[PDB]
Amino acid sequence: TRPANHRQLTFEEIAKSAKITVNEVELLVMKALSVGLVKGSIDEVDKRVHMTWVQPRVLDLQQIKGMKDRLEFWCTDVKSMEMLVEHQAHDILT
């Protein structure tokens, strides 16, 4: 659920969501990592977990359309840069 740019959960949040005390959060996250559900690290000093990859899941058509929109943005950026390079270097590449 968390967006890719933050994707940095905290011990209290995990405890509240999973109905377990803050102490067991580390063991829960380590079990997840060991099994292979999520990938990341644990920073006890700052009391945070940096999740970098969660297992793929089945998505509905609304989420597929969201992925399509994101692809549209990505393709627009690619085309913009291609046009920039072509226009600026037309002199050397004709």
Partner: protein
């Protein structure tokens, strides 16, 4: 009156923070289009027949 005229926050009595931080600009976006243009200009000057 002059404190009101100037943009001073008027905190505690005779205590007006000046916000010398100036927003402390830390955001950096790696200006990429302009750098690409500069390097392409370098290549153009290197390759073109003077």
């Amino acid at each position: 009156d002059y404190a009101k005229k100037r943009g001073w926050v008027l905190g505690p009595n005779n205590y007006y923070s000046f916000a010398s931080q100036q927003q402390k600009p830390e955001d950096t976006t790696i200006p990429s289009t302009e750098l690409a243009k500069q390097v392409i200009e370098y290549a153009r000057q290197l390759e073109m027949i003077v």
